[PDB]
């Protein structure tokens, strides 16, 4: 069999002063 | 078998002073 | 079999003073 | 059994003064 | 069995004054 | 049984005055 | 078996005045 | 077996005065 | 301000032979 | 401020032969 | 300002033969 | 500024023959 | 400023024959 | 300013015959 | 300022016949 | 500054025949 998985995310900001607390959680189980 | 898994993340911030707290978490299990 | 796994993360900041606290955690279990 | 795993991370900072505290943890178990 | 694993990390800083505290931990178990 | 593992890390600092405290730890267990 | 392992680390410093305290530890257990 | 392992560390220093404390530990147990 | 947060999860199984490929990932950003 | 955060995960598997592939990913950003 | 953060993970296995591949990634950025 | 952070992980194995490949990566950035 | 950080990890193995390949990576950046 | 950091890791092996290849890498950057 | 750092590692081996290749790397940069 | 750094490693060896190769690298630069 053939499995094609494509995960893409776009995140842009303009945090001039203090971008605060930001976390990016990426998980992939196969 | 043919497995094609691609993960792409775009995080761009135009900061100027103090990025603060950023946490990138990448968890891949295969 | 054929296994193709690619992870690309783009993190670009422009904070010209005090990056503060930035953490990148990459966990790959195969 | 053709295993192809590639992980590419791009981290660009511009902190002209005090990069502060940054941590990069890469865990590869195979 | 053919295993091809490549880890590429780009870390570009521009801290003209005081890098402060940076930590890079690369853990590879095979 | 062919194993090809390559780890390439690029770390560029521009701390013209006082690099301060930088730590790079590489752990390869084969 | 055929084992090919390459560990390439690039560390560029520009600490013209006082490097302070820098540490690099690479442990390879095969 | 065919063992082709090599570690290359690039330490580019631009320190004009007072290198201070620098720790370079290379532990290769094979 | 007072904030209380507790994440409790229970995962029990009986994988006598081959626990397969599982990945427990949790993320908390505050 | 008063912040109380607790994360508890219970993973109990009565394995016998070959645990297979298990990847635990804990990402906390504060 | 009082911060209380506690993380506890219980991973109990019984696999009496070949654990295979188990990885635990703990990333804490604060 | 009263910061209290505790991380406790329990990993109990019973692999009486060939633990195989197990990796524990702890990344703490404060 | 009062900071209390505790890292406690319990790893109990019973591999009476061949522990194989284990890797513990502890990275702490303060 | 009071900083209290404690790291305690318990690794118990029972490999009566051939411990094989074990690697413990501790990286503390303060 | 008061700095208290304690690193305690317990490594119990029972390799009665041929320890093979074991490596422990402790890197502390202050 | 009040510096109280303590590093202790407890190595329990039960090797009776052929310890083989063991590498203990302790690098603490202050």
């Amino acid at each position: 069999e053939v499995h094609h998985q494509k995960l893409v995310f776009f995140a842009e900001d303009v945090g001039s002063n203090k971008g605060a607390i930001i976390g990016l959680m990426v998980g992939g189980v196969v």
Side-chain angles (χ1 to χ4, degrees), chain A residues 3-30:
Chain A
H3 180 32
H4 276 245
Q5 198 175 29
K6 200 94 82 272
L7 257 61
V8 64
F9 286 80
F10 306 93
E12 52 96 6
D13 213 321
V14 279
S16 332
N17 181 89
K18 192 207 282 192
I21 306 108
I22 167 176
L24 296 175
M25 281 75 188
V26 190
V29 184
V30 44

